[PDB]
Amino acid sequence: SAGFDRHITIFSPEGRLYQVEYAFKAINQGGLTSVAVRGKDCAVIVTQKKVPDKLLDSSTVTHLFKITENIGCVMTGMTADSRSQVQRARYEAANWKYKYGYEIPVDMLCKRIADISQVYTQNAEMRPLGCCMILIGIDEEQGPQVYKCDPAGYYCGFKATAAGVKQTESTSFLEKKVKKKFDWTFEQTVETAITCLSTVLSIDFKPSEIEVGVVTVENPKFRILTEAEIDAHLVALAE
Amino acid sequence: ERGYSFSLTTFSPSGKLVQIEYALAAVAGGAPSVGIKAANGVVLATEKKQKSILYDERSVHKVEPITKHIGLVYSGMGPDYRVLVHRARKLAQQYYLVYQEPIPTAQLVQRVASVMQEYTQSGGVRPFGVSLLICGWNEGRPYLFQSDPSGAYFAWKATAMGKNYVNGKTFLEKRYNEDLELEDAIHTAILTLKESFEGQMTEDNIEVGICNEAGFRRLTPTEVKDYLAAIA
Amino acid sequence: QVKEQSILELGSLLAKTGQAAELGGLLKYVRPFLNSISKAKAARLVRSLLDLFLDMEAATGQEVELCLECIEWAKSEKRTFLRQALEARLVSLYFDTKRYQEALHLGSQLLRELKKMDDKALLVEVQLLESKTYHALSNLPKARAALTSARTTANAIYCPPKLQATLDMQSGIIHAAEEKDWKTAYSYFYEAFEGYDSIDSPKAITSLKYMLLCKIMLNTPEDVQALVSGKLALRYAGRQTEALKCVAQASKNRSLADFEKALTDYRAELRDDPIISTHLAKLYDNLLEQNLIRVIEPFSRVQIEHISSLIKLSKADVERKLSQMILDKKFHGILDQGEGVLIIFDEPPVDKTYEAALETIQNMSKVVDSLYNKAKKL
Amino acid sequence: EVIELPLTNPELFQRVGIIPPKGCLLYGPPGTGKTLLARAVASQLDCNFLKVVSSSIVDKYIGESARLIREMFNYARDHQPCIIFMDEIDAIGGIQRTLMELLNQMDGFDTLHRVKMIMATNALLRPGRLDRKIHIDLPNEQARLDILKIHAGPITKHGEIDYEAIVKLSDGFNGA
Amino acid sequence: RYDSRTTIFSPEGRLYQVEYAMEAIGHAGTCLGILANDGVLLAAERRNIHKLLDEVFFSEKIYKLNEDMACSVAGITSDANVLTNELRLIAQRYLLQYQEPIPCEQLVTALCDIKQAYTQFGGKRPFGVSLLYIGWDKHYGFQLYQSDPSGNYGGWKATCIGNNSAAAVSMLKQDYKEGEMTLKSALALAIKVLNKTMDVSKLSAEKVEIATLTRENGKTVIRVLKQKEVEQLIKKHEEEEAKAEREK
Amino acid sequence: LDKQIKEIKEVIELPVKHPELFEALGIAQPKGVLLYGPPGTGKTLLARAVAHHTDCTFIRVSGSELVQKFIGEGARMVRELFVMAREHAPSIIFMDEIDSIGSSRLEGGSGGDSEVQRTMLELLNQLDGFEATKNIKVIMATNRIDILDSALLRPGRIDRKIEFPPPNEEARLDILKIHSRKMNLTRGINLRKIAELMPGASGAEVKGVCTEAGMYALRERRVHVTQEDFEMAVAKVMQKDSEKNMSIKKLWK
Amino acid sequence: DVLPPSSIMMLTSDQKPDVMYADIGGMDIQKQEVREAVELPLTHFELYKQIGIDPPRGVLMYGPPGCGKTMLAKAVAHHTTAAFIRVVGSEFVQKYLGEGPRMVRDVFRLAKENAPAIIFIDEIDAIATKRFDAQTGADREVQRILLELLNQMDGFDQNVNVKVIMATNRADTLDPALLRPGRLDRKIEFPLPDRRQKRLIFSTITSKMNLSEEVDLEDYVARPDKISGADINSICQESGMLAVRENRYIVLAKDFEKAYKTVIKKDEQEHEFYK
Ligand SMILES: Nc1ncnc2c1ncn2[C@@H]1O[C@H](COP(=O)(O)OP(=O)(O)O)[C@@H](O)[C@H]1O
Ligand SMILES: Nc1ncnc2c1ncn2[C@@H]1O[C@H](COP(=O)(O)OP(=O)(O)O)[C@@H](O)[C@H]1O
Ligand SMILES: Nc1ncnc2c1ncn2[C@@H]1O[C@H](COP(=O)(O)OP(=O)(O)O)[C@@H](O)[C@H]1O
Ligand SMILES: [Mg+2]
Ligand SMILES: [Mg+2]
């Protein structure tokens, strides 16, 4: 039982791959939490921005990476592998554009990412990339879309989601929230995401501890909200 | 014989490829799937439950088309299913290009089985942890085959794979008659999913596909709702 | 194809009109038509027309005659499955007409044919009919064995909701007959009630009545109110459920007068059902026994008139019940009709010493016999 | 909320029907005050408050039972209310089947004097196997001040001493 | 131990992996072939006889390799399929280069060489497929060849591999009349052997597959017996058994 | 098992009853006999039968009685057993389930059992060593004849290894008659048909079928078992657990 | 003089499990089989003698966990007039080779001394695996324990008047020797409750509970979820405890529904790709 968890290509006695689950758990090593909420006409994601050192450069720590002007990603988990996967995703989007013209839909983009991860998991050559890849982006004819697609190679469509240490609690909070059908507006979506993160983390959420990125139908370009916009959204949330 | 339950390229003393059996167990530990072959067409049904209401049920489809007249439903590891379906589509289109005729269900199933077996012959490559169930209508005769990680393929008339497959097989051989029609086959498949289905069978939780002479098509939530209401 | 549907519609209309002779004439005329059509379709048409003919209340005594004519004609035409279906319907008709012995013999004859043959649905139906007829004749062990065989054959084929409801109802009846486990009887009756409700069959009300009777038999009358005012039971509210409710209330208050009044009022809904009638009579006997035992505890020489007044029953009825109770080693005492009292004493134990002494006397007598066998040698 | 209601009003528990509230768990960081929780809640009752931390109750197999499972409830009854406090169950005899049989034995059959087992370490989580589970958070810095004040009370300090900035530079995350 | 990989030699000098494969070949379903003066035949047992399984190919164990060859199979399904595909490729390649049918033994030797190469080079597990070969060639005519997982083939007049291969082979040796068997007699002997080689009584026609090689007017027709003739042969064997018990 | 019974009595009865025959023949008296076969074939039944018509001490040793915890307790127990058997000579020692002690010898190291090995070595010396036992015959019954080390199964410690194949048709009929003697059979209870319905019965499964028929009779509250009851008992006791997963069954074509 | 005579378990009169057959909800077939195999012979041996069938000596309950095997064992223990001994398979496997089989033979000898007796080996799945060609001492110890149990049950010294009851969950990984018609005559299956046994279990567990008029257990019984009896008991206890938490002594529909939703949840993580 426990002797089958040293190689990624060896099946456990009950029909399990232990290394993939181990990478899933490693996702939490960063100690961060990220949440995505898909509004009626917007997609908003908020992730913790931990800077436990005065000498760090807060501008170079942001975890929100822009794969493309129309598609967005937030890497949660191991930093190096997350950045490697973000670079691979940028390459995949560029190649899709170069070979087929139209911008690769987010679902396809990290479906390719997840296929790469799965091919990694099948052939025992490289340790699976221990970093959850949350994608957002407005898609014509399908409204806002947020897709989480992970080391083992599973990608699904999400109305709301989260990856990180506090994933179960955040998803339970979203389920409690996502059910009371209501106007999913830009401001409402950002407020719900920030509220879910605050309750899960139980933190006052100072403006310098969070980083937000929103894609909207009106402006279908990934935008990273500055400190002022985040603070205004927080003050609106409080009152 | 715990010493030989590790490598796929070594023979156990009794002569069992242990890793293939373990992969088959992993397949049987997946999501349910049942398919029935009717004299008029074929029916494929899988239970599509997401762990929470936060998952877009329409983003990932367990039943996917390989060509205009071939289908695919699985029971096991979905990420492996994605590569399996990609290989199946490539094989079907290669056959079409070389022969300019839609690949017959038998040949596509055989080539998919060969692809599966390709991974069960060298150390460092994990056997495909998913058993595919292929629909089809070639030469005016409905087809249903199951390709396993071991590479073997059969011609199942009607079977259920994944969790609670024993109960599904027992239900079959009871409500299955060799002279049914597509609607009755759909009803039997829905019932078979029901007897191994936990919770309410919503339109977004059960995905079905008819694969008759007209071709393979994934029933939209509307038709599934109508069928379930008729059965319910 | 059109002819079959037209004939079915005409038969339905005629059965509405009750022209049984006309129905038989149409059947005989169409006899050749079956030879011109498929075997399964012809058998289904004949079965449907025959069922419609039996549905009408025109029990002029020609129902069994028509069934026999149809079975013989089918045997002439060599339709094994159609003949088996006709025989099963004839067995059901014999049950309904209360001619169990002929129904029993026909079912026994047809059971072997259905067992060798692979049509297991008709086999399950015939075994259930045989179990019901066996129960109606008081042969509970054989009836339960037949029902167990029917259940075994049913858990090998597709049991439609109607067949499942019939099996559950009959097995609940059998369990109730064995007055030892009423919870399982109530569970089976609830399963049958749900199966019948999902089909809208008229037997749902009968299943509900049996459920209420099972609830009463468990010394839990209060649950009847909850059951009747349920999400599914509401649509069936009426005379029968209200009669069961009144009987449950009478049992709850534990008053013989209320029980007798309830039985007298709802005579049709309580005395026309053999299961309900027998079980309610047994419950009445138990209630009378308990009440009489309770009312004689303080007395030692109570006069019969006073005890009858206390129980609110006729003097003769209380006298007969007390006599039966005494004659059956129940509460100890002796009646004296000369003036009328129910004397109660303490029943001296038996003085086991005398039993032991008598046994020792017998043993010593046989030892003396053995010594007689000895002493022959002088 | 877990040990007060069962102790005070067994009638309301018996009125509803659900008798056994036993179970409980305090999984979290090691030794951050786990014993103290069972001590602070000992404000009322909790007299015996025995500790059997990972030892004498199953011992891998059954090593300990009755004389190491009942003798417990024994004094746990011939006396005022007490807490078994089978702390650190993650080190018992260092087996799972014995433990499963351990927690499903006559233990809850008696449940004498409202004695509630309070195991704390790190389908056995369902009712009848493990009651409410609480995860002890790492010592919060704002709480860290609370700890330094109470812990540092006895030591002879001077007036200028400040328990304010220590936590900012003291985030050891362990009570000890 | 000395069975970690095929390349490892035991101290006594035994390829433990090859022996393990040749032992595991016993799990496969029973197949046999009797060489007759006018032709050769093959018999196989369908282990999977579930009612829900649709028979679409009718040749699960008996495959056609060339216009004058056919080979039954016994062993792993994937290995069997790969071996049959390679057999067809080899036969057609030989036909293309030489423009005449492979003389049977050439195909057998090619497959045995492939299997030997697998059992020699490290990182490859031995092909656990032992398959009987039948065919006719201008050099020796009708022949039946046995292939083992180790690549060691051999000419044979009647052999059975798979379940209870030992009993079937022994009682074929007991009652095989050399040079005096006709195709009808060969089929009778094959049915007799299959009747007790498998535990299932009555030798159901659906549970047995028989293919025969005949030399008709220079065509080498490979015929797979239809269920009707299989049932006829089963009934003939039943009547023969009744006649034999008549002596009792 | 007439042949098996005669073969066993040739070693357990003839050598001790009439040793003069062996003295005249010039052959050494066979000492031990080993019973091996499919489970529930009748080995322990034959052992009990020999213990019945024995007129001789019939010391019994189970599988784990000679294992013991303290080192040297197994060897001491075996030595005391053989000394007591010799003192009460003649004697027969029955070692049921000799698979426990007497398995194939394993090397040293943590894996090896060692102690059971020492007990088995003590037994081996006792049965055939420097001191030759006189009038002590050992009957050991154990399934899996191939696992016993090739020292306990040497043709000097175990002379006759009688096989116990699952009863054939006539054997099954005889067993049914043996176990149905006290049953209340009904006319038309043909036992040949019932036996034909048991193709490979372990031998004790025949008794299981008889007991199941009796249990059906009890459940119906009668005292006679009919043929249908026997058929149902055969269908029940002879239940088989197939693979039930076509994927695994189809691996081997 | 000769002085008059618990040891391992030897279930004492004051140690009875305290569970009546009525408490066990809806196991008529299994109840009847267990009574026929372990209870009826002790009392009604006359029927067995009249039919001369040598009543079955062992029963092996097998099925999904939490279906109610141990409760049936407890009920037989409390309703039985014979000595009841309960052991768990994990107990037999001990260090100090020679203690597992020693304890097995000790339990069987104890049953023999005070007979009639019932020996219950629960979770015998531990030492029950198909005997393989053991190659290590630890591997051979479990096989030795199994051999000792087999010899004790149907061996040279027939027990007579002692019945052995075993409960497992696989029933197909067990050694064919144990499932021989002479050691485990009856193999009673305990399938997960269907729409019926679920209702009886709900009514039996709810019988003691205060409950409320507005609570219709039929609403929950008909739900397609496949839950064992242990799941039903957990649902009832959780609903009652939720009611108590809100300072309500009456359990209503909302609390029962919340408890049912909580209990049904058993996927946990599942990692989202195994399915
Ligand atoms: N939050 C706290 N409040 C008070 N004392 C604490 C706290 N955390 C740790 N301690 C100190 O640590 C010790 C408690 O350790 P404990 O949690 O019992 O270890 P373990 O969990 O291994 O039993 C006590 O001596 C106590 O003084
Ligand atoms: N040939 C036979 N004759 C009579 N009874 C048999 C025969 N074979 C098996 N049995 C019955 O099967 C049961 C098996 O018991 P046992 O002798 O312990 O089997 P084993 O020798 O396999 O341990 C016995 O009670 C016996 O009555
Ligand atoms: N029929 C039943 N009636 C009441 N509770 C039941 C029933 N079946 C199962 N249970 C619940 O589960 C327990 C019995 O399951 P158990 O026999 O312990 O399962 P297992 O044998 O798999 O360990 C009961 O104590 C109760 O909690
Ligand atoms: Mg034995
Ligand atoms: Mg249990």
From Swiss-Prot, chain A:
**Which sequence positions carry the modification called N6-acetyllysine?**
K97, K99
Give the Phosphotyrosine positions (modified residues).
Y154
**Is Glycoprotein found in the keyword set?**
yes
Q: Which GO terms describe its biological process?
A: positive regulation of canonical NF-kappaB signal transduction; proteasome-mediated ubiquitin-dependent protein catabolic process; proteolysis involved in protein catabolic process; regulation of inflammatory response
Q: Which Pfam families match?
A: Proteasome, Proteasome_A_N
* Gene Ontology terms: cellular component: cilium; cytoplasm; cytosol; extracellular exosome; mitochondrion; myofibril; nuclear matrix; nucleoplasm
Alphabetized, the UniProt keywords read:
Acetylation, Cytoplasm, Glycoprotein, Nucleus, Phosphoprotein, Proteasome
The subcellular localization recorded is: Cytoplasm; Nucleus
State the protein's name. Proteasome subunit alpha type-6
**From which organism does this entry originate?**
Homo sapiens (Human)
* Phylogenetic classification of the source organism: Eukaryota, Metazoa, Chordata, Craniata, Vertebrata
**Gene name of the record:** PSMA6
UniProtKB/Swiss-Prot annotation, chain B:
**InterPro entries from the UniProt entry:** Ntn_hydrolases_N, Proteasome_alpha, Proteasome_alpha-type, Proteasome_asu_N, Proteasome_sua/b
Which residues in this protein are found as N6-acetyllysine? Answer: K68, K169
On modification after translation, the UniProt record reads: Phosphorylated on tyrosine residues; which may be important for nuclear import.
Q: Which domain of life is it from?
A: Eukaryota
In the induction comment, the record states:
Down-regulated by antioxidants BO-653 and probucol. Down-regulated in response to enterovirus 71 (EV71) infection (at protein level).
Phosphotyrosine, modified sites: Y4, Y22, Y74, Y119
Q: Cellular component terms, GO, for this chain's entry?
A: cytoplasm; cytosol; extracellular exosome; extracellular region; ficolin-1-rich granule lumen; nucleoplasm; nucleus; P-body
- Positions carrying Phosphoserine: S5, S12, S14
Where does it live in the cell?
Answer: Cytoplasm; Nucleus
This protein's UniProt keywords = Acetylation, Cytoplasm, Nucleus, Phosphoprotein, Proteasome
User: Which SUPFAM superfamilies does the UniProt record give?
Assistant: N-terminal nucleophile aminohydrolases (Ntn hydrolases)
- A Pfam family of the record is Proteasome_A_N
| A Gene Ontology BP annotation from the UniProt entry | proteasome-mediated ubiquitin-dependent protein catabolic process
Quote the subunit structure annotation. Answer: The 26S proteasome consists of a 20S proteasome core and two 19S regulatory subunits. The 20S proteasome core is a barrel-shaped complex made of 28 subunits that are arranged in four stacked rings. The two outer rings are each formed by seven alpha subunits, and the two inner rings are formed by seven beta subunits. The proteolytic activity is exerted by three beta-subunits PSMB5, PSMB6 and PSMB7.
Tell me the protein family, please. Belongs to the peptidase T1A family.
What is the recorded name of this protein? Proteasome subunit alpha type-2
Upper lineage is:
Eukaryota, Metazoa, Chordata, Craniata, Vertebrata
Q: Which gene encodes it?
A: PSMA2
Swiss-Prot record, chain C:
Q: Which domain of life is it from?
A: Eukaryota
Q: Where in the cell is it found?
A: Nucleus; Cytoplasm, Cytosol
Keyword line: Acetylation, Cytoplasm, Isopeptide bond, Nucleus, Phosphoprotein, Proteasome, Ubl conjugation
Covalent cross-link (Glycyl lysine isopeptide (Lys-Gly) (interchain with G-Cter in SUMO2)), residues = K231
What induces it, per record? Answer: By FOXO4; expression in embryonic stem cells (ESCs) is mediated by FOXO4.
Q: Which InterPro entries match?
A: 26S_Proteasome/COP9_Components, PCI_dom, Rpn6_C_helix, Rpn6_N, TPR-like_helical_dom_sf, WH_DNA-bd_sf
Q: What is this protein called?
A: 26S proteasome non-ATPase regulatory subunit 11
Task: Please name the source species.
Answer: Homo sapiens (Human)
Curated annotation (Swiss-Prot), chain D:
Where, in this chain's numbering, is ATP bound?
G28, P29, P30, G31, T32, G33, K34, T35
Sequence intervals crossing the membrane: none
Q: Where in the cell is it found?
A: Cytoplasm; Nucleus
Q: Which residues carry this modification: N6-acetyllysine?
A: K60
Provide the function of this protein: Component of the 26S proteasome, a multiprotein complex involved in the ATP-dependent degradation of ubiquitinated proteins. This complex plays a key role in the maintenance of protein homeostasis by removing misfolded or damaged proteins, which could impair cellular functions, and by removing proteins whose functions are no longer required. Therefore, the proteasome participates in numerous cellular processes, including cell cycle progression, apoptosis, or DNA damage repair.
**Subunit structure, as described in the record:** Component of the 19S proteasome regulatory particle complex. The 26S proteasome consists of a 20S core particle (CP) and two 19S regulatory subunits (RP). The regulatory particle is made of a lid composed of 9 subunits, a base containing 6 ATPases including PSMC6 and few additional components. Interacts with PAAF1.
**What family does this belong to?**
Belongs to the AAA ATPase family.
Q: What protein name does the entry list? A: 26S proteasome regulatory subunit 10B
Upper classification of the source organism reads: Eukaryota, Metazoa, Chordata, Craniata, Vertebrata
Underlying gene:
PSMC6
